[PDB]
Amino acid sequence: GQRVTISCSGRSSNIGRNLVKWYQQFPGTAPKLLIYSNDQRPSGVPDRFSGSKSGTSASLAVSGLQSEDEADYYCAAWDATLNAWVFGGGT
Amino acid sequence: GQRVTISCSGRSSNIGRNLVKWYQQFPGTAPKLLIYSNDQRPSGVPDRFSGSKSGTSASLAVSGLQSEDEADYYCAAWDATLNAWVFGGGT
Amino acid sequence: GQRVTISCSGRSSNIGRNLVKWYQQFPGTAPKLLIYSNDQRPSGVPDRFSGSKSGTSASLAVSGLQSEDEADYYCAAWDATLNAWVFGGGT
Amino acid sequence: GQRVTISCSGRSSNIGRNLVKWYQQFPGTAPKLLIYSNDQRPSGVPDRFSGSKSGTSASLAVSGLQSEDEADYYCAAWDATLNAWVFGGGT
Amino acid sequence: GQRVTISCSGRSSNIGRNLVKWYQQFPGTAPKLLIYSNDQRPSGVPDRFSGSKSGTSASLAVSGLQSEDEADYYCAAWDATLNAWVFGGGT
Amino acid sequence: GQRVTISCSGRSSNIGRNLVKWYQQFPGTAPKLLIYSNDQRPSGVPDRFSGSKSGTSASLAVSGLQSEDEADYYCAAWDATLNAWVFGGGT
Amino acid sequence: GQRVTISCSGRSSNIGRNLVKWYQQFPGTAPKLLIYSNDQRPSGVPDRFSGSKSGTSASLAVSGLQSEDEADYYCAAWDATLNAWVFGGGT
Amino acid sequence: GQRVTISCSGRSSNIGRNLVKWYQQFPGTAPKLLIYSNDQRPSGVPDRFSGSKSGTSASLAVSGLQSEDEADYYCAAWDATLNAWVFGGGT
């Protein structure tokens, strides 16, 4: 008689009285990007993979006022076996 | 008699009294992008994969005021086996 | 007698008294993109895959005021087996 | 006697008193895109696939005021087997 | 005696007192797109597939004021077997 | 004695007191598209497929004021078997 | 004695007191499209298919004020078998 | 009779009375990026991988006012086996 209880909560999860007050006044933004020559050549060859930001990836992130970037991948299992029983009887 | 209880909550989940007040006043934005030559060549060859942002991918993210980017992939299992029983009787 | 209870909630899920007040006043936006030469060649060859943003993909995301981009893929299972029983009797 | 209860809620799901007040005043937007030469060649060859944004796909997303892009794929199962029983009796 | 209860709710589902107040005043939009040469060649060859945005597809999404794009594919099952019983008796 | 109850709700489903107030005042839109040469060649050859936006398809979506695009495909099953019983008696 | 109850609701379904107030004042729209040469060649050859937007299809969607495009395909089953019983007695 | 209880909470999880008051007044931002020649060549070849920010990836992150970037990958298991029993009886 096995029991497994995985209550793996996520992103802004089971929230009681949450509040996110934001404000932004008077921003002036002029984020430009200019390139004369930029050649990345990122050729990723994985075999077995499970990770979050997999990218062998030469980026260029110019941020002005706001740029929120996350990645969720919850409760994962590449190879899980939570309970087991084996018996042998081969005469 | 096995029991499994996976209450893996997600994104803004089971929320009681949530509130997101936002404001943005007076923004002035001029985000331009110019390229003379930029040739990425990202040729990703995976075999077994489970991860969130898989991309071997040379990007260029110029952000003005706001750019929200997430990725959800919940409660996943590449290979899960939660309960088991085996018996052998081959005479 | 097995029991499985997967209440894997999703996106803005089971919400009690949720509210998203937004505002945006006075934005001025001129996001242009210009390219003289940009040839990505992303030829992804996966075999077994389960992940969220699969794309080996050299993008260029210029964001003005707002650009929200997510991806949901919930409660997934590449190979799951939640309960089992085996018996052998081959004489 | 097995029991399975998968109440995997989705997008804006089971909502009590939800509200999304929005506003946008005074935007001025001129998002143009110009290309002299841009030839992506993304020829993706998968075999077994289950993920959300599958596209090996070099895009160019210029965003003005607003561009919301999600993708839902809920409660999925590449290969699931929730309960089982086996018996053998071959004399 | 098996029981299966999959109440997998969808998009704006089972909603109590939902409201989406929107407003947009004073927008001025001039989103043009011009191309001298852009030849994607995306020839995707999958074999077994179940995912949401399948497209190996180099797009160009210039967004003015608003462009909402989602994709729903709910409660799916590539190969599911929720309950079972087997017995053997071959003398 | 098996029981299956799949109340998989859909799009704007079972709604109590739903309301979508919209407004849009003063928009001026001039979204043009011009092409000197753009030849996609997307020849997708799938074998077994179940996903939502199947298209290996290099598009160009210029959006002015509003363009809403979704896709619903609910409660699907590539191969589902919800309950079963087998017995053997071949003497 | 099996029971199956699939109340899979659809699009704007079982609605209590629904309302969609819309307004649009002062739009001026001039969305033109011009092509010097654009030859897609999308020749899709599927074998077994069940998905929503099947089209390997390089489109060009210029949107002015409004263009709503969805696709419904509800409660589907590529191969479903909800209940069963088998017995063997071949002497 | 085994018991496993993994209540591995996530991001802003199980929150009682959370609040995030923000403010930002008077910012003036002009973050530009210019390149005469910058060619990264990051070609990552992993074999077995499970980590969070996998990218062998020479980036250039110029930040103006705000740029929040995280990555979540929760409760993972490259190879886990939580409980077991083995017996041998082969005469």
Author numbering:
A (entry chain B), B (entry chain C), C (entry chain D), D (entry chain E), E (entry chain F), F (entry chain G), ...: 15 to 105
Give verbatim lines from the article.
The misfolding of immunoglobulin light chains (LCs), which are constituents of natural antibodies, gives rise to the disease. In this study, we used electron cryo microscopy (cryo-EM) to determine the molecular structure of an amyloid fibril underlying the pathology in an AL patient with severe cardiac amyloidosis. The fibril protein is not glycosylated and encompasses mainly the variable light (VL) domain, which is typical for λ-AL amyloidosis. Although free LCs or LC oligomers can make pathological contributions to systemic AL amyloidosis, cardiac pathology arises largely from massive amyloid fibril deposits that impair the natural ability of the heart to pump and to contract.
Cryo-EM imaging of the extracted fibrils at 300 kV allowed us to reconstruct the dominant fibril morphology at 3.3 Å resolution based on the 0.143 Fourier-shell correlation (FSC) criterion. The fibril consists of a single protein stack, termed here protofilament. It contains parallel cross-β sheets with intramolecular backbone hydrogen bonds. The fibril helix is left-hand twisted as confirmed by map-inversion and shows a pitch of ~300 nm as well as a polar topology. The three-dimensional (3D) cryo-EM map was fitted with a continuous polypeptide segment, corresponding to residues Gly15–Thr105 of the AL fibril protein. The remaining part of the protein roughly outlines the shape of a ram head. Head region and stalk lie on either side of an intramolecular disulfide bond that is formed between residues Cys22 and Cys89 (see below).
